[PDB]
Symmetry: C3
């Protein structure tokens, strides 16, 4: 199993969600994060006064499906412009379904 | 070392926290994320207008303790009903204590 | 490639950001999370009524740079006092640049 994580432009969330569902991928979770590009001095130190909003999507997928999921996310999240973001795949050592306690 | 991550129902957070403390596990962090189940068309595209609130808990645990921690989280977070979520274990390659700079 | 994740005190975010930029590291994202230290009984159960705010920073870095980045984050985020947090390095199995579709 692999954890697929992607940092995408907020307005691309629905396209990515649609792409994943079409593949029959379930279990996506999303949250807001911030990136940086615009600074102001306060008490001798520099403070960022502007941020770029992003959405972080995370979904666990089988070894046999992850490459297809990664390709699908990339195609859906792409604009070609600055700030499009990244997709990272991490190996999962163990996964548990909380509802039943089943492992792997 | 292992990073244990769990996506749980929000009302289960306190049970999970209690379970972990009873094991003497410290260093839990939590944040809100969203899952999906309820769509509306805007400018020709489908937009989700409803979400399922979840809580993501993350805690680093030793190789000798992680299986016990995973079992404890599962038991505490379980309802048996739809939406109970998942627990993922990821291998940590290096860990640093910021307070002292100690590694591993 | 490695994913470097750090849970730091919120007031240390700008120092960490400055340290990383000085190294020429790009692609940092940040979000708020909560840790725990202060409980109240509601319907027979214990509820936490206080939390410690933290910031979670995540950045992907090359194998050749990660140790330097980890050292830099630790030095910048350190106060020496309780609650300073942790840095975790996770192996990345695959990375994709969404803007161009390039892999690794």
């Amino acid at each position: 199993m692999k954890l697929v994580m992607a940092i995408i432009k907020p307005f691309k969330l629905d396209e990515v969600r649609e792409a994943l569902t079409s593949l029959g991928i379930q279990g996506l979770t999303v949250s807001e994060v911030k990136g940086f590009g615009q600074t102001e001095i306060y008490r001798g130190a520099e403070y960022s006064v502007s941020f770029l909003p992003k959405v972080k999507v995370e979904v666990a997928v089988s070894d046999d499906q992850y490459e297809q999921v990664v390709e699908a996310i990339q195609k859906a999240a792409n604009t070609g412009r600055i700030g499009d973001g990244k997709i990272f795949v991490l190996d999962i050592a163990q996964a548990v379904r909380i509802r039943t306690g089943e492992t792997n």
